[PDB]
């Protein structure tokens, strides 16, 4: 009998001053906000690394019409939807033979072989970036199946961590992913078969690769001015360094004139040493005193109200430290996000589960919201089975729970890394997780870059 308040879909803004609700269908008709001319890509891998990449990419410029769907049965060509030309021409290739990578494949020590695998990969990248007159835009690393099947800490985390000092955006693929037809499961069809979803599969590669190189594919439209979105995740470090050490990541959603700035403040804070996910007052002020200045040097003022996010609820110890370094016109407020309330909702008719966006409010402080479900714009469920509703409650300070719930929705819509209709969590935490994931792989990073293209 308890009513559920429906939150209208967060509204994203496109180029030409044009405005569409969905992103990937909006990106099908209309294009990016910024024009990037071409993309001077680079490819590093084995001899077959090119052939899988050249055949795939040279197949990806044409319109690959996705088949047997109403959700997203199309892809209207790369350059047509992006107004940027980038193809097999301009592919700068560095060769990693099979022998040298093979000699690093059969090592027993996993720690050194993971570090050696990335060392040979990036040393070609670093040398090519510096000691080559031809300018690359972003690299596309290709590794074969046996590499991570045998050697794999995490190779992906180690790879991105070591390149942050040189600020060279990259991307990692595999023969299983691109040439899904090449490797075939001998006792059936290919394991990762995605032919039915192949058309909009290419949407994801075509989107992030755009973002890694000056890409501004879509922009938020419902962001109010003067509000700061500070997503604060708590990531742990365990391997080769002390387990009871917690770090932090910080995002931004400021608006300068027109335009949403989405640079991720890193300034990693290894101060928590007790294994608890809380910030000492010494560096607690360091969050805002660095973040607020970034607002000041970008806007020329201080925000009138800041929405700070966290996967873990705060305590009174932090809030006194947070507000004491803020003036009397920038009321702090602490929103905590929790994907741990396994509530489940059902409906009488239809094999379909519940639609997306219908939110239930518990009281003036707490509410439930469904980021995923039976999205109607695609006529199919975003999450096929019953999902977990997000439990968004306001912890410290005061704010209107109606708009906070809307703003959380106003964060899930964009995901430059994933060409999806809607994400299951606000990106001020999702991209916060990736920053913490990568910044923790290497331990000699100082003043790391803030742009998301490097992750």
């Amino acid at each position: 009998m308890k009513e559920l308040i429906y939150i209208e879909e967060p509204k994203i803004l496109f180029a030409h001053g044009q405005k569409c609700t969905d992103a990937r269908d909006g990106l099908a008709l209309f294009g990016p906000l910024n024009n990037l001319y071409g993309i001077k890509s680079g490819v590093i891998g084995t001899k077959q690394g090119l052939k899988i990449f050249r055949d795939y990419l040279d197949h990806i410029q044409k319109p690959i019409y996705n088949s047997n769907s109403i959700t997203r049965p199309m892809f209207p060509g790369f350059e047509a939807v992006f107004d940027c030309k980038w193809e097999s021409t301009g592919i700068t290739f560095k060769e990693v033979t099979n022998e040298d990578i093979g000699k690093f494949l059969y090592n027993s020590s996993t720690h050194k072989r993971t570090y050696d695998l990335v060392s040979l990969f990036i040393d070609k990248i670093i040398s090519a970036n510096k000691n080559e007159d031809e300018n690359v835009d972003v690299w596309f690393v290709i590794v074969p199946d046996e590499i991570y099947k045998y050697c794999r800490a995490q190779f992906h985390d180690q790879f991105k961590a070591r390149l942050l000092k040189h600020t060279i955006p990259t991307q990692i693929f595999r023969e299983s992913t691109l040439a899904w037809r090449d490797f075939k499961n001998a006792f059936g069809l290919p394991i990762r078969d995605f032919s039915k979803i192949e058309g909009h599969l290419a949407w994801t590669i075509s989107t992030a690769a755009f973002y890694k190189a000056g890409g501004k594919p879509w922009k938020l439209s419902d962001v109010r001015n003067g509000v700061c979105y500070l997503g604060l995740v708590y990531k742990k470090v365990e391997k080769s360094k002390n387990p009871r050490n917690a770090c932090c990541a910080a995002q931004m959603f400021l608006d300068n004139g027109d335009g949403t700035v989405f640079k991720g403040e890193v300034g990693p804070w290894y101060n928590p040493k007790n294994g608890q996910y809380h910030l000492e007052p010494k560096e607690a002020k360091a969050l805002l005193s660095q973040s607020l200045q970034s607002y000041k040097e970008q806007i020329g003022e201080y925000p009138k109200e800041v929405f700070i996010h966290a996967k873990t609820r705060f305590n009174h110890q932090e809030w006194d430290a947070f507000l004491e370094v803020t003036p009397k016109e920038t009321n702090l407020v602490g929103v905590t996000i929790s994907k741990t309330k396994p509530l489940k909702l059902y409906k009488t008719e239809g094999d379909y589960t519940i639609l997306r966006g219908n939110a239930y409010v518990v009281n003036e402080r707490s509410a439930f919201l469904w980021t995923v479900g039976y999205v109607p714009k695609i006529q199919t469920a975003l999450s096929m089975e019953v999902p977990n509703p997000l439990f968004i409650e306001i912890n410290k300070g005061e704010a209107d729970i109606k708009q906070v719930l809307k703003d959380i929705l106003s964060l899930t819509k964009l995901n430059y890394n994933a060409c999806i209709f809607a994400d299951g969590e606000p990106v001020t935490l999702r991209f916060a997780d990736k920053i913490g994931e990568i910044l923790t792989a290497s331990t000699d990073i100082k003043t790391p870059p803030l742009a998301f293209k490097y992750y």
Partner: protein
């Protein structure tokens, strides 16, 4: 466009009378265990909390017959329901924590009373059924136990008590498997592997109906059911979930 909206919660439409604290001074040693007891009770400082009488625990503890009702502390549950308790002897958060301890403890005791066999998960205990208590392997024209490939699947529930929104029983439904009914497969990976394989062939309506079917068989009356934490007082829980109001239907 509007939608009737049922959930996986389970409201507590009647809460027991009051919290009874036992002045069990020197009656119990440090080495004592209470999980074996048929009634939900846990120790706090030198006290024991429950909703039943002292002699209710004497069947398994004949020594405890000397306890007198003059040494009992009574705290009203509906006082904790509003979250209005404020005392230095025990905090409201401790009071609410104490209740959810009892309700979680009470649920399994009735569960082990019912002829539904259990399973040990990572952090909680589920309850799966077996062929032998059913007609035509179905209940209320809903397939409650099925046979797939060379194995058979079993519906299961995992309920926990929460107090923040309101007194409610919060169930979690998930599938479990056996080789021939009597014995399950003792490999976690394969048991999970078959779960997704059979789980991905299901939909929203069938997931709801099986969950509701298990409660209906679990229900003791048509309108609701009573959890028999004790033989005298009980926690009554509706056999129908906490319904909601969905003011938007599907659009085409």
């Amino acid at each position: 466009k509007e939608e009737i909206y049922d959930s996986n919660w389970l409201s507590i439409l009647s809460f027991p009378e009051e919290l009874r604290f036992h002045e069990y001074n020197w009656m119990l040693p440090k080495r004592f265990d209470v999980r074996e007891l048929t009634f939900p009770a846990v120790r706090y400082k030198n006290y024991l909390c429950t909703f039943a009488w002292a002699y209710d625990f004497t069947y398994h503890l004949p020594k405890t017959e000397t306890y007198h009702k003059s040494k009992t502390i009574r705290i009203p549950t509906e006082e904790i329901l509003s979250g209005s308790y404020d005392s230095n002897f025990i905090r409201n958060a401790e009071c609410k924590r104490l209740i959810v301890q009892l309700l979680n403890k009470a649920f399994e005791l009735r569960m082990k009373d019912k002829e539904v066999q259990e399973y040990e998960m990572s952090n909680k205990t589920a309850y799966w059924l077996e062929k032998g208590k059913l007609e035509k392997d179905k209940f209320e024209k809903t397939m409650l136990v099925g046979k797939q490939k060379d194995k058979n699947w079993h519906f299961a529930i995992s309920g926990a008590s929460k107090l923040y929104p309101f007194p409610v029983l919060m169930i979690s439904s998930h599938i479990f498997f056996t080789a021939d009914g009597k014995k399950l497969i003792d490999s976690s990976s394969v048991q999970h592997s078959s779960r997704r394989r059979q789980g991905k062939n299901w939909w929203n309506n069938t997931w709801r109906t099986k969950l509701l079917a298990f409660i209906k068989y679990l229900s003791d009356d048509d309108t609701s059911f009573y959890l028999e934490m004790g033989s005298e007082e009980k926690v009554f829980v509706s056999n129908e979930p906490v319904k909601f109001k969905g003011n938007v239907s599907y659009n085409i």
